[PDB]
């Protein structure tokens, strides 16, 4: 029952964040002013785990310096935290055969891939897992997935067809599916030979992946022999249900509320606005948890810490967030945009929908739309940004320069 183990496997999405992510990993980027490891860690500590295994495929030293300076290498953390050093850019899966060669994991454990952010009570996911244990001795795992029924077509990189059972929600089959920009590729195929004794099934598109899989310790031993697998779901959950091994069924869970995972900036923006708005109760921002901030909450979704210098005649619209020690100026405008700590905002800037990180001295009269600025990258006077710019870490910009759409400058 108890003694929950766990493993987080980050550092597989460096293709996504390429102007960034080459000086510090994806897992160390501030979603809301704090690098998003703890958005997984506080969740699975509330899940009540006892050990985690951080796979750090790149920048392994600037993982463990933060980990040893975290609140998790202090002798009351609900799990002890361990890392795994790595040669660069391993495909997933083979980390589990390396684990089985090492042989630490016994019992149920979390296969949390990527970096998630969720409100789901994992406690009520345990009884689904144990009902799977009691009513099936041929189980594999459970796959919790969200019900984002009001939007298809906008969960960017991979759209999937999680076809599963009516009654027991056993995952029948899986298939990758193309993009709305491609009008060409129009077919999927589900061959009905394994569809013999099911008699009732559902095929949905509105289930977004979140890669939070909890299983038994039998399935890494199952995964040991079949050495052909390189992904976690494009190959494995197809190649474990497609009549390959007999008597091994995989199950999948559907929640009712918010549970999401980082894919790219067209998901990073949406989850930043859902978390920064009150769409993520109770895992919200004003509670001041992570690095003992001082966020207060006005109406209209305003987040301010202590020592914020809001200058006279400024206006701050919906859904913003400002760290401590900053300084904005006269005539500036803030709307729907998180601002990092200790920056120096100049004069008359209309910041809108852009995620400005820590220590960003922005020059005067230099308006910004969606142009999220990473740490220490200062600007100058009359620097008109525009949409899509993902200007990177420590980038000096001179005056009067214009940018274009998706100009991934670094």
């Amino acid at each position: 029952e108890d003694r929950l183990q766990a493993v987080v496997l980050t550092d597989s999405y460096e293709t996504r964040f390429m102007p960034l992510t080459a000086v510090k990993p994806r897992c160390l980027l501030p979603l809301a002013n704090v690098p998003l490891i703890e958005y997984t860690l506080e969740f699975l500590a509330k899940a009540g785990v006892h050990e985690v295994f951080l796979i750090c495929s790149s920048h392994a030293n600037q993982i463990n310096d933060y980990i040893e300076n975290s609140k998790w290498n202090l002798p009351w953390s609900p799990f002890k935290i361990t890392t795994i050093m790595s040669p660069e850019a391993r495909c997933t899966g083979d980390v589990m055969r390396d684990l089985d060669n090492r042989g630490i994991i016994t019992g149920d454990f979390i296969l949390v891939s990527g970096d998630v952010l969720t409100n789901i009570d994992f406690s009520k996911m345990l009884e689904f897992h144990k009902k799977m244990h009691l009513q099936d001795k041929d189980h594999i795992s459970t796959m919790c997935l969200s019900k984002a029924s009001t939007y298809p077509k906008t969960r960017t990189i991979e759209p999937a067809a999680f076809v599963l059972d009516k009654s027991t929600s056993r995952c029948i089959y899986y298939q990758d599916l193309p993009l709305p920009s491609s009008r060409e590729k129009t077919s999927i195929q589900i061959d009905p030979e394994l569809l013999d004794n099911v008699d009732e099934f559902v095929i949905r598109n509105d289930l977004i992946d979140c890669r939070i899989d909890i299983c038994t310790s039998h399935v890494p031993l199952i995964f040991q022999e079949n050495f052909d697998y390189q992904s976690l779901r494009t190959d494995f959950v197809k190649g474990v249900i497609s009549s390959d091994i007999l008597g091994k069924h995989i199950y999948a869970y559907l929640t009712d509320e918010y549970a999401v995972r980082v894919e790219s900036w067209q998901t990073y923006d949406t989850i930043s606005q859902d978390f920064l708005g009150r769409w993520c109760y109770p895992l919200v921002l004003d509670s001041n948890i992570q690095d003992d901030q001082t966020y207060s909450y006005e109406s209209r979704h305003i987040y301010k810490e202590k020592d914020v210098v809001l200058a006279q005649s400024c206006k701050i619209g919906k859904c913003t967030a400002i760290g401590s020690g900053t300084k904005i100026g006269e005539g500036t405008k803030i709307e729907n945009s998180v601002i990092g700590r200790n920056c120096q905002i100049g004069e008359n800037i209309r910041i809108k929908n852009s995620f400005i990180w820590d220590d960003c001295i922005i020059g005067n009269n230099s308006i910004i739309d969606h142009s999220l600025i990473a740490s220490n990258a200062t600007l100058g006077s009359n620097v008109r940004l525009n949409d899509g710019c993902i200007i990177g870490f420590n980038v000096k910009i001179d005056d009067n320069m214009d940018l274009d759409r998706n100009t991934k400058i670094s």
């Binding site: 509330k46 009351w76 409100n119 984002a148 009001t150 939007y151 906008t154 509320e257 918010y258 949406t270 606005q273 708005g277 009150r278 769409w279 993520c280 109760y281 109770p282 919200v284 509670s287 948890i289 207060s296 909450y297 006005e298 109406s299 209209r300 979704h301 919906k318 859904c319």
Partner: protein
């Protein structure tokens, strides 16, 4: 020791809403403080007030929008501060002890020129018995309420209550029919979407003891405000103004409709729910909740912004009387009960005196 793990596991319990309300969090922080005082090493009592005060500062800084975990520690700091003065005056041979309970609180700080005698361990046992009679006070707050509020209500009056989620009003409105035989009815609104899992349970518990009850929704309370003669509030915390901080919702407006129709407004409250603080900025003492359960569409890209509220403040002007276990009191006479149970020192409960 094995006490520093307990104080932060209670901190992490109070962060993520595993304890809620005002009863349970007060009992749990009092249990935590008894665990703390059982393993304290002070060597002087003015060290012990700092060892009990930095814990209070950390725990108030952890979660300011629940006050029952922030005033029990102030109350026991007060009752442990009180026996400094009693022992100290008596020990001095020259003037002994005045032993007078009430003093002018302006002037005595404006003239300052600067046997069982000590019995060093006695502060521990007096703190433990203070823990014990705080338990024996908080566990039976309804007795003074059911004693004195029947003197304040009459028989054939239809009632309204906007706080269904309070055990005080539930026990009082059961015992008003169980022992006394005063028949009436109770309108009840739901604080959608928070008390809608509680107001229906409230109506079920009142229909089990079958007091003529009926549920109004939120929007239909002004039409029925002219009929009703009285409202009653089961609050969560009450400040030195009498401006209380309530349960889930409703009461910031229905009490206003009570004030505008000159309808009396009650407020039952346990004595532990007091706070010697002040509503400096009123939004900072108000817990705005999440936008999930007021529209379950979860609008992806259109994304109409919205606001929820899980805390309604009332001012003291809209409220009329306080029914506590130590008698009935004006809203303009809540300060003196606080200074009868708190001191001037622990309101800025912080080591960094700025």
């Amino acid at each position: 020791s094995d006490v520093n793990v307990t104080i932060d596991t209670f901190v992490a319990k109070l962060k993520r809403r595993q304890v809620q309300g005002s009863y349970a969090i007060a009992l749990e922080t009092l249990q935590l403080l008894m665990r703390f005082i059982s393993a304290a090493r002070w060597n002087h009592v003015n060290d012990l007030i700092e060892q009990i005060r930095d814990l209070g500062n950390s725990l108030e800084k952890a979660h300011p929008t629940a006050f029952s975990c922030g005033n029990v520690i102030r109350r026991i700091l007060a009752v442990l501060r009180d026996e400094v003065e009693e022992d100290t005056m008596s020990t001095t041979v020259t003037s002994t002890s005045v032993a007078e309970p009430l003093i002018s609180s302006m002037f005595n700080l404006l003239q300052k020129p600067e046997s069982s005698m000590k019995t060093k361990t006695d502060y521990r046992q007096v703190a433990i018995q203070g823990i014990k009679d705080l338990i024996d006070e908080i566990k039976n707050i309804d007795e003074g309420i059911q004693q004195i509020a029947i003197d304040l209500i009459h028989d054939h009056e239809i009632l309204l209550t906007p706080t269904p989620d309070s055990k005080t009003v539930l026990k009082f409105l059961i015992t008003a029919r169980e022992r006394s035989n005063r028949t009436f009815t109770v309108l009840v609104t739901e604080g959608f979407p928070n008390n809608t899992k509680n107001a229906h349970e409230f109506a079920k518990k009142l229909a089990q003891h079958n007091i003529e009850t009926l549920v109004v929704p939120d929007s239909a309370v002004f039409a029925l405000m002219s009929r009703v003669g009285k409202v009653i509030i089961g609050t969560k915390a009450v400040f030195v103004n009498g401006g209380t901080i309530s349960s889930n919702s409703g009461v910031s407006s229905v009490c206003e409709c009570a004030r505008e129709f000159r309808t009396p407004v009650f407020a039952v409250a346990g004595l532990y729910k007091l706070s010697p603080l002040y509503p400096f900025d009123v939004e900072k003492f108000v817990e705005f909740g999440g936008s999930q359960r007021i529209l379950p569409r979860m609008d992806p890209r259109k994304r109409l912004d919205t606001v929820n509220q899980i805390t309604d403040y009332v001012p003291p002007e809209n409220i009329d009387i306080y029914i506590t276990n130590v008698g009935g009191f004006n809203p303009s006479f809540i300060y003196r009960i606080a200074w009868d149970n708190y001191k001037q020192i622990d309101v800025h409960l912080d080591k960094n005196k700025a």
